[PDB]
Symmetry: none
Subunit: 76 residues, 6 copies
């Protein structure tokens, strides 16, 4: 008797990760008339003043990919 073995798996698979700030940011502060005036203020501790600024902070410790694949043909 004749034997023919044809081991031809085809892998076209996609493993994909997109992580972080994906969307677009359109920030248009001002445009009209803006007055932020301050006269006589006294500060005993720390100040942050943010006027029309943008902070984008992105951390990606994750988002990695792992593909493990084993092909084995054992004959007799």
């Amino acid at each position: 008797g004749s034997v023919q073995i044809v081991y031809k798996p085809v892998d076209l698979s996609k493993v994909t990760s997109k992580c972080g700030s994906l969307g677009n940011i359109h920030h248009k502060p001002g445009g009209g008339q803006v007055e932020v005036k301050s006269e006589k203020l006294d500060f005993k501790d720390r100040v942050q003043s943010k006027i029309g600024s943008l902070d984008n902070i992105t951390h990606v410790p994750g988002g990695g990919n792992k593909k493990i694949e084993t092909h084995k043909l054992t004959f007799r």
Copy 2:
């Protein structure tokens, strides 16, 4: 008896990572009339003033890819 073994797996697979600040930032501060005037202020500790500034901070400790593939043919 005749034996023919054809080990021809095909790999076209894609493992992909995109991580961090992916999206576009369109920041247009001002455009109109903006006045941030300050007259008599007194500060005893640290000050941040941000006016129309952009900070983009991206950390990617992650986003790595790992592909392990083992092919084995053993005959008799």
Copy 3:
């Protein structure tokens, strides 16, 4: 009796990483009329003043790729 072994695996696979500031930054501060005047201010500790500045800070400790592939044919 005849034996024919054809070990011809094909690899066209793609392992890819893109990490960090991927997206475009369009920062257009000012454009109209902007006045940041300050008259009589007193500061006892550190000051940051940012007016229309851009900081892009990117750290990529990650984003590395690891491909391990083992091919083995053993006969008798």
Copy 4:
């Protein structure tokens, strides 16, 4: 009597046109298993066959801008 005339108009205006194919095209034909087949066909006249092709055809005869501005100071 003293005369002081101060002609200081400020123009910060934007006249802007964007015309044509503005949006992004993401065309991914195939992806799975596609078989297009034809055995015995006879054509007496013209044939177009399009399989996963993209045509983007853009005509912009318009989209032009016209700004006319006249400044005039006439004294006595």
Copy 5:
């Protein structure tokens, strides 16, 4: 009497035209398994076959900018 005439118009205006194929094209035809096959066909007239091709055709007869500005100071 004294006469002082100050004629200091400021023009910072922007006239801008962007015309044609503005958006990005991402065309990824195939990707999976695509078979296009034809056996016994007969064509008496013209044939176009397009398989995964891209045609971008951009005509811009328009998109031009015209700025006319006249400044005039006339005294006595």
Copy 6:
């Protein structure tokens, strides 16, 4: 009697045209398994076959800019 005339108009205006293929083209045909085949075909007239090709055709008869500016000071 004294006369002082100060004709100092300021022009920082921008006239700009960008016309044609503005956007990016990312064309990645094939990628997986593509078979195009044809056995016994007969053609009596002209054939175009496009397989994964890119044509970018740009005509810009337009997109020109015209700035006319006239400054005039006339005294007595």
